[PDB]
């Protein structure tokens, strides 16, 4: 919840949200984090459900973010893929 890996995903969620919706949210902190591993024989993947606090025009607001992280292998080369799938307020 308060680890570096969580924060990077939360900042990534905010950076991606601003990019697609052309917004200007400033990440502050993560307040809750739930993980759901979804591996297969050919991927180490996890779906992250994050609740974070960001400043919307100076005012702090809470948002729920859904981030998908996928690790696959080709021969012996690993590829990490991250994706923001949902970003909504509370």
């Amino acid at each position: 919840e308060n680890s570096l890996e969580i924060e990077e995903l939360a900042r990534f969620a905010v950076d991606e949200h601003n990019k697609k919706e052309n917004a200007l949210l400033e990440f502050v902190r993560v307040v809750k984090a739930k993980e759901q591993a979804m591996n297969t024989g050919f991927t180490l993947a996890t779906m992250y459900y994050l609740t974070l606090e960001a400043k919307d025009g100076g005012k702090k607001k809470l948002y729920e973010a859904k981030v998908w992280v996928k690790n696959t292998q080709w021969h012996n080369a690993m590829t990490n893929f991250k994706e923001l799938q949902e970003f909504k307020p509370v």
Binding site: A37, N39, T40, G41, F42, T43, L44, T72, Q73, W74, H75, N76, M78
Partner: protein, 172 residues
């Protein structure tokens, strides 16, 4: 939870050498009203509609991800197929395992190239040795089995090591 179809490989190796034979089979229910199968290669629908998809002699183009579907079974998860070209290849059915799963590895040589004094290595340390080329088995997988794997043997007097591949064991 959806009733997902499943693609499985016969033989089970997802890493194969060029010219090997591979048959992809769709595990799914088939109704008499509609007994066809939808196959996908690299996310694109292909023409074959049979329950099995045959690859007589594999080429690098046959590599990629495969998915299948039937009337009664929903789109399967992808199965990965890697066609390699080289003297030696360490084979496996997948690279992600769960605790207690069996791990069956095979040191495969190019066509018509006998190989002996074979060793399976994990993170650089040997795990099992065979004078005659045999398969490596781990009936009960454990978190300590995770690591980089490769096999090396002798083509007569030539000592050869296969390309490495990373295996991961997850909680059960």
């Amino acid at each position: 939870d959806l009733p997902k179809a499943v693609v499985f490989l016969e033989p089970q190796w997802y890493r194969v050498l060029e010219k090997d034979s591979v048959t992809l089979k769709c595990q799914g229910a088939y109704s008499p009203e509609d007994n066809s199968t939808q196959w996908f290669h690299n996310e694109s629908l292909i023409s074959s509609q049979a329950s099995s998809y045959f690859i007589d002699a594999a080429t690098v183009d046959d590599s990629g991800e495969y998915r299948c579907q039937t009337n009664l079974s929903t789109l399967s998860d992808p199965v990965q197929l890697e066609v390699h070209i080289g003297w030696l290849l360490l084979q496996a059915p997948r690279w992600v395992f769960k605790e207690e799963d069996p791990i069956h590895l095979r040191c495969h040589s190019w066509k018509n190239t006998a190989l002996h004094k074979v060793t399976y290595l994990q993170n650089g340390k040997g795990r099992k040795y065979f004078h005659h080329n045999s398969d490596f088995y781990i009936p009960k997988a454990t978190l300590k089995d995770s690591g980089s794997y490769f096999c090396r043997g002798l083509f007569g007097s030539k000592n050869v090591s296969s390309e490495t591949v990373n295996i991961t064991i997850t909680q059960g």
